[PDB]
Amino acid sequence: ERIVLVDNKCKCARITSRIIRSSEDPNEDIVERNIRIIVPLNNRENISDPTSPLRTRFVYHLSDLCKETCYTYDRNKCYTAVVPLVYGTKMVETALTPDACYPD
Amino acid sequence: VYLLPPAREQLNLRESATITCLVTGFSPADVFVQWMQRGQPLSPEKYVTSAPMPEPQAPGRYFAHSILTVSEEEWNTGETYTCVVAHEALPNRVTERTVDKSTGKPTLYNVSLVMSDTAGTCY
Amino acid sequence: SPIFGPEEVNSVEGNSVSITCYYPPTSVNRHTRKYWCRQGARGGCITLISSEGYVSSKYAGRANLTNFPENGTFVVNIAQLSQDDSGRYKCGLGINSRGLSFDVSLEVSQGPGLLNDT
Ligand SMILES: *[C@@H]1O[C@H](CO)[C@@H](O[C@@H]2O[C@H](CO)[C@@H](O)[C@H](O)[C@H]2NC(C)=O)[C@H](O)[C@H]1NC(C)=O
Numbered sequence: 508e509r510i511v512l513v514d515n516k517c518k519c520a521r522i523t524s525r526i527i528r529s530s531e532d533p534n535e536d537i538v539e540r541n542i543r544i545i546v547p548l549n550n551r552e553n554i555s556d557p558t559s560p561l562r563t564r565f566v567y568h569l570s571d572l573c574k575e576t577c578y579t580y581d582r583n584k585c586y587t588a589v590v591p592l593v594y595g596t597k598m599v600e601t602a603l604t605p606d607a608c609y610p611d
Numbered sequence: 612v613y614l615l616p617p618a619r620e621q622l623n624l625r626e627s628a629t630i631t632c633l634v635t636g637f638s639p640a641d642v643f644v645q646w647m648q649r650g651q652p653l654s655p656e657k658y659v660t661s662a663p664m665p666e667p668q669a670p671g672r673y674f675a676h677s678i679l680t681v682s683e684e685e686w687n688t689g690e691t692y693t694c695v696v697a698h699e700a701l702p703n704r705v706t707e708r709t710v711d712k713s714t715g716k717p718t719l720y721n722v723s724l725v726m727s728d729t730a731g732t733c734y
Numbered sequence: 735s736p737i738f739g740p741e742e743v744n745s746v747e748g749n750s751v752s753i754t755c756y757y758p759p760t761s762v763n764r765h766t767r768k769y770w771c772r773q774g775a776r777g778g779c780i781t782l783i784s785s786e787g788y789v790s791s792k793y794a795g796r797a798n799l800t801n802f803p804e805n806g807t808f809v810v811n812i813a814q815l816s817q818d819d820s821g822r823y824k825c826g827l828g829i830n831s832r833g834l835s836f837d838v839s840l841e842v843s844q845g846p847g848l849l850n851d852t
Contacts, residue, residue, distance in 0.1 A: 543734070582762060583760065583762060606762055606765050606766035607761065607762045607765075609761055609762075609764075609765045611761050611765065729776070729777020729778060730777070731773070731775075731777055733833055
């Protein structure tokens with residue numbers, strides 16, 4: 508019944524809303540803006556370079572994302588960082604998350 | 612013109628609530644004052660008011676008061692009770708002010724912190 | 735919410751059962767965990783069988799789980815039911831902690847009879 512104002516899958520924010528149609532009094536209703544965030548406290552600040560510090564601040568200018576440096580691995584679109592391997596050197600690909608980088 | 616809602620102490624025996632249309636800081640004297648209620652002036656018999664009392668501190672200035680004994684529910688339901696002041700020291704010579712329950716009530720808000728209590732509900 | 739399966743399934747002891755749960759046929763859902771978990775009044779799914787191979791210690795030989803990415807499906811087969819299996823369950827994918835999942839109810843009852851007159 509709620510109305511997802513925003514669902515930002517690379518900040519794990521989700522502003523919904525729902526008018527709490529009150530007890531059947533006159534129009535003394537109050538609309539209601541649920542919010543929800545799942546901050547990781549595990550990832551980098553360069554989400555796609557696991558050679559950086561972790562994170563401390565998590566800033567949500569909701570104005571900005573009520574409409575690109577956002578910090579959760581989105582499930583569906585996957586990432587990578589070309590990484591050297593040595594068997595001689597070779598500068599070669601990776602797949603920084605599995606089960607989504609599957610060329611299928 | 613000011614206005615102070617009734618004392619919470621009054622709102623514990625739950626009979627009557629009193630409102631103080633304090634008027635002050637003005638000159639000259641002979642201020643008439645009336646109480647609106649949604650464009651409806653109350654009778655002057657409904658309320659009571661002073662005469663312009665000479666102001667102690669502000670020297671060449673006068674002040675007065677008025678009260679009205681709104682009962683408990685009769686204030687507890689909205690009914691903003693506008694208080695209007697008639698004088699000659701104003702651009703349009705008149706002013707009015709009003710109040711309700713919710714003149715303040717500023718942002719009461721129940722934070723909650725939780726751990727170690729699996730409630731079987733999502734988040 | 736995007737997972738779909740049968741709400742309640744009933745059978746009686748000694749029988750087999752086979753449950754199918756559905757997911758959108760995208761790349762990840764064709765290539766990631768599926769699970770069957772059991773909750774209770776204690777706050778948490780305990781995993782019973784997984785698509786990665788692990789089978790619960792209490793479910794060894796009893797059941798298994800297979801995925802048909804082409805059907806956009808994964809199937810759960812349970813055999814040798816008992817009355818100790820009746821409770822609330824969930825099919826789902828990915829990490830158990832989130833809810834990319836679907837809730838299932840299960841009720842097992844004994845095989846009646848013994849009355850040759852009926
Ligand atoms: C820091 O992040 C930026 C962008 O988030 C990365 O910039 C590019 O990332 C792509 C990813 O495939 C690479 O192919 C490019 O070569 C990167 N450009 C540059 C100038 O590095 C960047 O790689 C990240 N930091 C590091 C050290 O990789």
